[PDB]
């Protein structure tokens, strides 16, 4: 029992360490890894019970269908052969077909929610710069955001991030003009 | 899990529900409620006449949509809460604040989207509830507000000030000032 507890803990740690990272989920090597890992765990003797192997498979699929890159991983791994019981089936057949649809829909929703949240964060930064007390500070923050974009995505243009950044630049120019008017009026 | 339904099913225990709400949702010490109960609720009956008249007076002088147009069952629940807080504290303001808090938590006040078409009706929150989820009263609220807008738009002669929303025993009635238009919304 102690050895089986340790084996299950090791398998869980490795597998969820791989599958709770959307960056690792998004690579094709993720699906290849999952297939080969379940296979090796079966053959070596790790994942001792076919029952515990099914538990691990279901929980890994649940974890993937909660991350950003999970849906891609599920598309790739759906047609991967596996042998839990005497018969051999794909993960699409091992998992219920309705359960596969549920996994697919929840993974799609997780992807949409993650992308929406990232856009919320980016536009939060843009608007936080736009609502500065001193518009010159707003210009400084906008130039910093421009530096970050120019790091991550230098080659492309007219991406939604870039369009928001350009609109922010124009708005900060309008703030420049209004600030000039205010300071002259104060003088 | 669901406060309003439990309160509705057991009106006699409104005081117990109020004490539990004060102990759990509000930050009130159990000990102070305990010794407030044990201490001075002694004046009996002869001033309970004046207590009854004071409850009706405080309702008459309220100038509040939830208290002026208090729905029927919440009348008895609110009288129990007002009496209990008045007995425990002696403060009439505390009793009014508690009874108002109960009414606002347990009702939604439909308001005329105008400069003042305000307070077209105070409906108990459990009457608008669809399905067993207590939070789903909002779906019934959306249906009822769409009904109000449709009644206004369909009949031009009815204006925002003409509609009255009120609840009978098991129904919500949406009617104009005349009796020509009444639609009945039931659970």
């Amino acid at each position: 029992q102690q050895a089986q507890k340790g084996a299950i803990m090791n398998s869980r740690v490795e597998l969820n360490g791989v599958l709770q990272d959307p960056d690792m989920l998004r690579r094709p090597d993720s699906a290849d890894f999952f297939e080969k890992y379940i296979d090796n765990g079966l053959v070596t003797g790790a994942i001792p019970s076919d029952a515990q192997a099914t538990q691990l498979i279901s929980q890994a699929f649940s974890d993937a269908s909660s991350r950003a890159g999970g849906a891609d991983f599920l598309m790739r791994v759906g047609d991967k052969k596996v042998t839990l019981n005497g018969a051999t089936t794909t993960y699409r057949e091992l998992i219920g077909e309705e359960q596969w649809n549920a996994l697919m829909v929840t993974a799609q929703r997780s992807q949409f929610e993650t992308d929406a949240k990232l856009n919320e964060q980016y536009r939060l930064k843009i608007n936080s710069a736009l609502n500065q007390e001193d518009p010159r500070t707003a210009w400084e923050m906008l130039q910093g955001i421009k530096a970050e974009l120019d790091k991550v995505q230098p080659d492309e243009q007219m991406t939604p991030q870039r369009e928001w950044l350009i609109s922010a630049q124009e708005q900060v120019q309008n703030q420049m003009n209004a600030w000039t008017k205010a300071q002259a009026k104060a003088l | 899990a669901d406060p309003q339904l439990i309160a509705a099913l057991y009106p006699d225990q409104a005081e117990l529900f109020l004490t539990m709400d004060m102990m759990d949702k509000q930050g009130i010490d159990p000990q102070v409620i305990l010794d407030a109960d044990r201490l001075t609720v002694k004046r009996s009956k002869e001033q309970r006449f004046e207590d009854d008249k004071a409850f009706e007076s405080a309702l008459n002088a309220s100038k509040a949509p939830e208290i002026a147009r208090m729905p029927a069952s919440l009348r008895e629940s609110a009288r129990k809460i007002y009496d209990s807080v008045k007995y425990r504290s002696g403060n009439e303001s505390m009793a009014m604040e508690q009874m108002t808090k109960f009414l606002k938590e347990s009702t939604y006040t439909f308001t005329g989207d105008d400069v003042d078409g305000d307070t077209v009706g105070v409906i108990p929150k459990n009457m608008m509830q669809v399905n067993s989820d207590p939070k789903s009263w909002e779906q019934g609220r959306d249906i009822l507000e769409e009904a109000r807008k449709g009644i206004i738009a369909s009949n031009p002669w009815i204006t925002n000030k003409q509609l009255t929303m009120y609840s009978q025993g098991d129904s919500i009635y949406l009617m104009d000032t005349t009796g020509q238009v009444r639609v009945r919304y039931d659970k």
Binding site: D21, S66, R67 | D133
Partner: peptide, 17 residues
């Protein structure tokens, strides 16, 4: 964080038999 919680489903009562 990385994980996105699955939005609630209406609870229903079921029995095997």
């Amino acid at each position: 964080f990385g994980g996105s919680s699955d939005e609630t489903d209406t609870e229903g009562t079921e029995v095997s038999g």
